Enzyme design. Structure first.
Site, mmCIF file in Angstrom:
data_model
loop_
_atom_site.group_PDB
_atom_site.id
_atom_site.type_symbol
_atom_site.label_atom_id
_atom_site.label_comp_id
_atom_site.label_asym_id
_atom_site.label_seq_id
_atom_site.Cartn_x
_atom_site.Cartn_y
_atom_site.Cartn_z
ATOM 1 N N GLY A 16 0.714 -1.338 -0.093
ATOM 2 C CA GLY A 16 0.067 0.006 0.030
ATOM 3 C C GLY A 16 1.033 1.180 0.116
ATOM 4 O O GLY A 16 2.035 1.176 0.271
ATOM 5 N N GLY A 19 0.849 8.465 2.869
ATOM 6 C CA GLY A 19 1.114 9.830 2.602
ATOM 7 C C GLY A 19 2.196 10.192 2.015
ATOM 8 O O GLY A 19 2.319 11.174 0.957
ATOM 9 N N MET A 20 3.486 9.668 2.158
ATOM 10 C CA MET A 20 4.772 9.796 1.618
ATOM 11 C C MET A 20 5.675 8.663 1.511
ATOM 12 O O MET A 20 6.908 8.747 1.601
ATOM 13 C CB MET A 20 5.460 11.070 2.311
ATOM 14 C CG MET A 20 5.971 10.948 3.832
ATOM 15 S SD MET A 20 7.235 11.597 4.277
ATOM 16 C CE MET A 20 7.472 11.204 5.912
ATOM 17 N N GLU A 22 5.801 4.349 -0.335
ATOM 18 C CA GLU A 22 5.239 3.218 -0.795
ATOM 19 C C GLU A 22 5.941 2.199 0.073
ATOM 20 O O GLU A 22 7.153 1.974 0.251
ATOM 21 C CB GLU A 22 5.376 2.781 -2.322
ATOM 22 C CG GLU A 22 6.964 2.960 -2.788
ATOM 23 C CD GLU A 22 7.291 2.597 -4.207
ATOM 24 O OE1 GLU A 22 6.227 2.251 -4.961
ATOM 25 O OE2 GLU A 22 8.175 2.675 -4.633
ATOM 26 N N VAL A 23 4.998 1.249 0.553
ATOM 27 C CA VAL A 23 5.587 0.094 1.446
ATOM 28 C C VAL A 23 5.313 -1.473 0.652
ATOM 29 O O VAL A 23 4.256 -1.781 0.071
ATOM 30 C CB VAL A 23 4.676 0.109 2.818
ATOM 31 C CG1 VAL A 23 5.040 -1.058 3.628
ATOM 32 C CG2 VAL A 23 4.349 1.383 3.434
ATOM 33 N N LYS A 38 9.374 0.073 4.078
ATOM 34 C CA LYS A 38 8.631 1.436 3.633
ATOM 35 C C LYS A 38 9.673 2.229 3.023
ATOM 36 O O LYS A 38 10.708 2.859 3.693
ATOM 37 C CB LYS A 38 8.072 1.953 5.029
ATOM 38 C CG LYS A 38 7.291 3.118 4.768
ATOM 39 C CD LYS A 38 6.935 3.911 5.945
ATOM 40 C CE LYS A 38 5.775 2.991 6.755
ATOM 41 N NZ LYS A 38 5.354 3.807 8.082
ATOM 42 N N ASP A 136 2.287 10.324 18.035
ATOM 43 C CA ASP A 136 2.031 10.258 16.724
ATOM 44 C C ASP A 136 0.693 9.404 16.416
ATOM 45 O O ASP A 136 0.733 8.610 15.491
ATOM 46 C CB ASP A 136 2.974 10.113 15.646
ATOM 47 C CG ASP A 136 2.963 10.326 14.267
ATOM 48 O OD1 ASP A 136 1.901 11.079 13.935
ATOM 49 O OD2 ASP A 136 3.620 9.940 13.591
ATOM 50 N N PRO A 139 -4.995 6.450 12.930
ATOM 51 C CA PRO A 139 -5.406 5.384 12.482
ATOM 52 C C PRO A 139 -4.655 4.603 11.434
ATOM 53 O O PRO A 139 -4.529 3.470 11.348
ATOM 54 C CB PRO A 139 -6.603 5.886 11.485
ATOM 55 C CG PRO A 139 -7.172 6.905 11.941
ATOM 56 C CD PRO A 139 -5.709 7.661 12.705
ATOM 57 N N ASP A 154 5.434 2.901 14.372
ATOM 58 C CA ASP A 154 5.971 4.623 14.517
ATOM 59 C C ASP A 154 6.036 5.192 15.582
ATOM 60 O O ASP A 154 5.794 6.366 15.969
ATOM 61 C CB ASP A 154 5.283 5.459 13.237
ATOM 62 C CG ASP A 154 5.386 4.846 12.026
ATOM 63 O OD1 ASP A 154 6.123 3.730 11.664
ATOM 64 O OD2 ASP A 154 4.731 5.531 10.979
#
Ligand SMILES: Nc1ncnc2c1ncn2[C@@H]1O[C@H](COP(=O)(O)OP(=O)(O)OP(O)(O)=S)[C@@H](O)[C@H]1O
Ligand SMILES: [Mn+2]
Length: 268
Positions: A16, A19-20, A22-23, A38, A136, A139, A154
């Site tokens: 998926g 925001g910044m 591609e994993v 990531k 941080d 969802p 994270d």
């Protein structure tokens, strides 16, 4: 985008886009294990701002050992035909983030939602023990495996998930995580975050001025006892909310088990 970087990781399918980044689902060749990688997007990588933003959030993500916490393994930045691409290697979670669920499946069933957020309190609490504040919570940083296991990620290091103390530039503690986790719980129960606006500054104002509308006033099927818990975690003053993640869990467990919360009743 890269077939195989680091000569140690063979990147596979994209799991998926965030925001910044591609994993990818990589394969660790040395330890012979399936892993998640990531990688910062190639388009955002020719922009020093994002490059540095990723590079910072890469060496600063806390590595903790807990069944409810996504383990970080490696960090680096290999040269590709698109310049350097900073990347972080971590525990492969076969599943989705709470964001994915909210924007595809919709609002979760209360009991399931209570379970997920109760399980996240376990991880948050362990982190607090080691003296690490997540700061941080959102969802996209809370995952659910195919086996319903909650995986949070994270730690260390988002417009509508910040605490009033974060929005005022002040310090951040365990209680700050409680507020944010409360925002996630609110959204996952109703369908939208407690506060929405036309600009980030609007939401930040709402966080430290406007009160949250009771979850049941926004969605069907939500008990008043659930309002009490949610809204206490969304209390403006840190002393009014849950002092520890364990405290919040203790109270979610009650609601889950059809018991009265120790949170002040939401009336009028
Ligand atoms: N540890 C993981 N294991 C397996 N899949 C993951 C993992 N982390 C992220 N993904 C997948 O990658 C997608 C994006 O991950 P994100 O962490 O949301 O990316 P991001 O760029 O950090 O976005 P942010 O946090 O909002 S900036 C998710 O929706 C998951 O499907
Ligand atoms: Mn992220």
């Amino acid at each position: 985008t890269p077939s195989h970087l680091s000569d140690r990781y063979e990147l596979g399918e994209i799991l998926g886009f965030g925001g910044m980044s591609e994993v990818h689902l990589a394969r660790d060749l040395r330890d012979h294990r399936d892993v998640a990688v990531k990688v910062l997007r190639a388009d955002l990588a020719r922009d020093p701002s994002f490059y540095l933003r990723f590079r910072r959030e890469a060496q600063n993500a806390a590595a903790l050992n807990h069944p409810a916490i996504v383990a970080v393994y490696d960090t680096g930045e290999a040269e590709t035909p698109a310049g350097p691409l900073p990347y972080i290697v971590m525990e492969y979670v076969d599943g989705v983030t709470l964001r994915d669920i909210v924007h595809t499946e919709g609002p979760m069933t209360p009991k399931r939602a209570i379970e997920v957020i109760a399980d996240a309190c376990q991880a948050l609490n362990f982190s607090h023990q080691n003296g690490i504040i997540h700061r941080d919570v959102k969802p996209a940083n809370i995952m659910i495996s195919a086996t319903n296991a909650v995986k949070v990620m994270d730690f260390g290091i988002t417009a509508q998930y910040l605490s009033p103390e974060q929005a005022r530039g002040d310090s951040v503690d365990a209680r700050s995580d409680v507020y944010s986790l409360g925002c996630v719980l609110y959204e996952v129960l109703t369908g939208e975050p407690p506060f929405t606006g036309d600009s980030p500054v609007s939401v930040a104002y709402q966080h430290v001025r406007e009160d949250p509308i009771p979850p049941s006033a926004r969605h069907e099927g939500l008990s008043a006892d659930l309002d009490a818990v949610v809204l206490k975690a969304l209390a403006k003053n840190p002393e009014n909310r849950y002092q520890t993640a364990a405290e919040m869990r203790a109270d979610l467990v009650r609601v889950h088990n059809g018991e009265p919360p120790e949170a002040p009743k939401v009336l009028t």
